[PDB]
Amino acid sequence: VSLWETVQKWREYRRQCQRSLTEDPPPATDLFCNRTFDEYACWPDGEPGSFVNVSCPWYLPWASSVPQGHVYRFCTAEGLWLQKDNSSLPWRDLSECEESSPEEQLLFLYYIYTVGYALSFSALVIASAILLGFRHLHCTRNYIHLNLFASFILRALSVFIKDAALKWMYSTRAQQHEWDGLLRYQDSLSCRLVFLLMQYCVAANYYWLLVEGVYLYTLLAFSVASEQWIFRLYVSIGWGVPLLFVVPWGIVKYLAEDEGCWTRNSNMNYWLIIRLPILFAIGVNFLIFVRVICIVVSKLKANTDIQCRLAKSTLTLIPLLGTHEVIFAFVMDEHARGTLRFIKLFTELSFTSFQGLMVAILYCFVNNEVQLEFRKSWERWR
Ligand SMILES: CCn1cncc1Cn1c(CN2CCC(c3cccc(OCc4ccc(F)cc4F)n3)CC2)nc2ccc(C(=O)O)cc21
Numbered sequence: 151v152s153l154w155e156t157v158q159k160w161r162e163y164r165r166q167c168q169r170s171l172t173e174d175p176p177p178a179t180d181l182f183c184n185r186t187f188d189e190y191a192c193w194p195d196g197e198p199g200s201f202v203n204v205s206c207p208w209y210l211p212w213a214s215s216v217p218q219g220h221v222y223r224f225c226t227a228e229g230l231w232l233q234k235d236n237s238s239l240p241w242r243d244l245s246e247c248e249e250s251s252p253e254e255q256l257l258f259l260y261y262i263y264t265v266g267y268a269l270s271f272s273a274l275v276i277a278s279a280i281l282l283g284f285r286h287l288h289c290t291r292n293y294i295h296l297n298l299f300a301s302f303i304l305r306a307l308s309v310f311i312k313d314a315a316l317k318w319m320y321s322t323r324a325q326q327h328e329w330d331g332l333l334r335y336q337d338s339l340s341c342r343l344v345f346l347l348m349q350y351c352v353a354a355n356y357y358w359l360l361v362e363g364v365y366l367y368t369l370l371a372f373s374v375a376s377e378q379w380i381f382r383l384y385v386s387i388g389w390g391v392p393l394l395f396v397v398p399w400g401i402v403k404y405l406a407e408d409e410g411c412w413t414r415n416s417n418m419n420y421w422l423i424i425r426l427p428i429l430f431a432i433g434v435n436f437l438i439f440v441r442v443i444c445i446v447v448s449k450l451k452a453n454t455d456i457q458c459r460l461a462k463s464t465l466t467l468i469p470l471l472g473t474h475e476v477i478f479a480f481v482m483d484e485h486a487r488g489t490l491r492f493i494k495l496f497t498e499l500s501f502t503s504f505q506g507l508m509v510a511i512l513y514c515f516v517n518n519e520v521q522l523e524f525r526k527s528w529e530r531w532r
Pocket residue numbers: 152153154157256312316318319321322323332333341345411413414489492495
């Protein structure tokens with residue numbers, strides 16, 4: 151319950167009052183004013199000499215708390231409606247149907263996670279720059295990791311492009327009804343493609359964690375890897391599978407639902423075609439995590455010194471897979487959208503923004519080999 155539903159209800163109110171002012175009863179003679187709409191009340195015909203203590207529109211966030219809204223207008227029998235004393239603009243009133251920290255939460259945490267994505271995009275690109283050819287010791291595990299990084303890269307890129315092109319950060323307190331372009335931006339020109347893009351990227355970012363888990367498995371249990379054929383399969387299912395079930399989602403929406411950036415509702419629950427396989431991939435990665443922790447804790451049974459050392463391993467493994475995401479998927483989900491959806495999803499996206507940093511710093515900056523690169527190349531420079 152916030153300004154978002156207010157914009158929506160206002161759009162429906164305009165939708166209705168427009169057809170009303172269209173097909174309202176016509177009068178006989180000109181001694182009665184015209185019918186207009188001033189972004190604040192669909193002003194129909196009225197007799198001069200008097201105001202009309204009509205209810206100020208119901209779309210107001212406080213209207214639900216006031217049946218006694220009353221906005222007036224004095225159609226001058228000698229002409230138009232009223233203008234203020236000595237002014238030239240048309241006169242109105244709000245005397246009675248006017249109105250902590252309601253939603254500042256939203257903007258604060260928006261900044262809180264954009265800082266995090268910024269850090270992650272800074273770190274992962276350097277991690278990748280290391281592993282391109284400069285280390286020049288790049289096995290197939292290195293190749294899979296180097297290609298995993300691109301997932302986080304594109305995810306952060308998409309989030310940034312989305313927040314930018316929406317330009318929503320600074321209109322959050324648009325008190326005055328200048329909502330024309332806002333709805334005019336929710337037309338099928340951009341919101342469509344940009345949102346589909348952010349969806350495809352955030353899906354590929356889970357499938358790549360999945361294929362990474364699969365490769366960690368088929369190297370450890372199946373014991374075989376025929377040729378480069380296995381990698382030709384893996385990178386193929388990397389950026390190919392997520393594209394398989396989002397373009398159908400487009401086939402659904404573009405011809406199925408008219409104006410309105412769909413924002414996950416058509417009052418028929420159409421939002422499964424994308425999110426179901428995401429939960430699928432999360433489940434797969436989670437099971438793989440369990441099996442790998444079992445394998446490791448077995449192989450460690452050699453030689454009270456177990457757990458204390460097991461932690462330094464399982465903490466390294468969490469960001470590698472997506473084992474963090476399962477908790478959010480277990481707490482944030484809800485069968486309905488709304489402001490609660492945005493708030494919860496953004497808290498998720500805040501605590502999630504950081505695990506771009508963690509992977510980069512744990513799998514290219516702290517192992518023995520990465521440090522050994524510098525430890526040996528300083529010994530050639532100076
Ligand atoms: C990009 C799709 N999208 C496009 N239009 C909305 C969304 C919803 N949406 C957004 C962007 N949202 C923008 C409104 C913001 C907001 C909150 C409450 C009041 C308010 O008032 C100010 C407000 C009023 C009008 C306006 F034109 C913008 C305005 F900002 N603005 C909140 C963020 N990011 C998303 C990520 C994931 C999902 C998903 O469904 O998975 C949905 C997401």
